[PDB]
């Protein structure tokens, strides 16, 4: 049904679908910056599920391939997100409204200011291109059903099916990224220069996700975690 | 400059820069070896894409720096192409998926390179359209990682002749006589796989360093 909406209906429900902004919790001597951090993303990963579950198209696939998807792709949607509200904010990441960071601040954690330059340089460029909510929206979708999908397991007829579906959903979401560049008043040689910007710098995103992996394994097993929030009972 | 070109000449310059296949000559060992060789031959390709040697000595060795295996895997996985199941990482060494289980930790970059390889076949992806993602690369994977004035310029430019190189694509494909629909579509598939080719780069770079 999802290949069925319409440009608008797509951006809506997307739009629709944005999970909440939450908060770094603490007394302001229970956790280390890193902790704080860690923790903030924990929580925002059982929202992240509600948010992916409301993508057209998603809740179509098999849990195994859901899952797949997300572990695959949880970092970048975290960290795009993060440079999405870190925009009006040049020299600083909002974490959260209540973790405000600058790059000096991210020295004190051991080894992450390479990827806090990286997360600030990311959003300049946002910034710099006028990226718009709309558009931001669509990108995350695409990060979701992109990162993970040419690395799906099996090769059987139901993974194949699985993968036309999925590359149904991206060709669906690619439209409507043209389809708002078109409204918004856009030369077709604009608009598909300014589409090529914008997936040129998903692969910086998976670049920073790569590197937060290896930090993070630096210092249950994710599949099993979210499955287990995925896989709901009807009571 | 690059940025007068028209697309055919554009697609005429990164054809002739077009860097040669190399041959093998206890795994790792060969492997490293033949990319080893491979990078003076980048490097020079480097120098023949439009608009690279306008930037700064240091911005060229950072954008080689950070874009050198995802230039050696696209194009292993591009001469890969019509050898379904097989990495023909030289013309005399052609290895199966069975072979990359030899060595620890290889057999999932092996699987991931297998299926790029595998979408390339499945979307019919062209010479012409290969040069241009192979430039691409080049260009846009350490431009995010270069604040100063000259920084300004550089990005600019770099920029700037991506827009060039996009234009070309989309041209090569309105030839090909795909609606424009089709375009849009095909450019966006294209692009994502270079997603998936930054996820391996960043992989085999773990690897190495392993060892
Ligand atoms: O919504 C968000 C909430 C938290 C983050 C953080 O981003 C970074 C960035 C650099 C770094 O070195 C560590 C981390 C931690 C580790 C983590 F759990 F992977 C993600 C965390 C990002 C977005
Ligand atoms: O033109 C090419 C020449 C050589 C290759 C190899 O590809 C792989 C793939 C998986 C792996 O585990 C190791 C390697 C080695 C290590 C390296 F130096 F990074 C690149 C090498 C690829 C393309």
Redesign the interface.
């Not at 998903?202 to 670049?207: A, E, K, M, N």
């Given at each position: 049904l999802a290949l069925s909406l319409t440009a608008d209906q797509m951006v809506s429900a997307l739009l629709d679908a944005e999970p909440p902004i939450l908060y770094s919790e603490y007394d302001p001597s229970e956790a280390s910056m890193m902790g704080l951090l860690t923790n903030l993303a924990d929580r925002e990963l059982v929202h992240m599920i509600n948010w992916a579950k409301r993508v057209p198209g998603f809740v179509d696939l098999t849990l195994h391939d859901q899952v797949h998807l997300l572990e695959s792709a949880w970092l970048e949607i975290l960290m795009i997100g993060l440079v999405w509200r870190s925009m009006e904010h040049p020299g600083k990441l909002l974490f959260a409204p209540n973790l405000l960071l600058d790059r000096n601040q991210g020295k004190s954690v051991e080894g992450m200011v390479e990827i806090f330059?990286?997360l600030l340089?990311?959003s300049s460029?946002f910034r710099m291109m006028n990226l718009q909510g709309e558009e931001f929206v669509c990108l995350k979708s695409?990060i979701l059903l992109?990162?993970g999908v040419?690395?799906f397991l099996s090769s059987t007829l139901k993974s194949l099916e699985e993968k036309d579906h999925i590359?149904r959903v991206?060709?669906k979401i690619?439209?409507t990224l043209?389809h708002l560049m078109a409204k918004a008043g856009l030369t077709?040689?604009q608009?598909?220069?300014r589409?090529?910007?914008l997936?040129?710098?998903?692969?910086?995103?998976?670049?920073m996700s790569?590197?937060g992996m290896?930090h993070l394994y630096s210092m249950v097993p994710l599949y099993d975690l979210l499955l287990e929030m995925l896989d709901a009972h009807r009571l």
């Open positions: 330059d990286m340089a990311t460029r695409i992109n990162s040419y690395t590359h991206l060709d690619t439209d043209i077709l040689q608009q598909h220069q589409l090529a910007q997936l040129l710098i998903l692969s910086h995103i998976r670049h790569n590197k290896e």
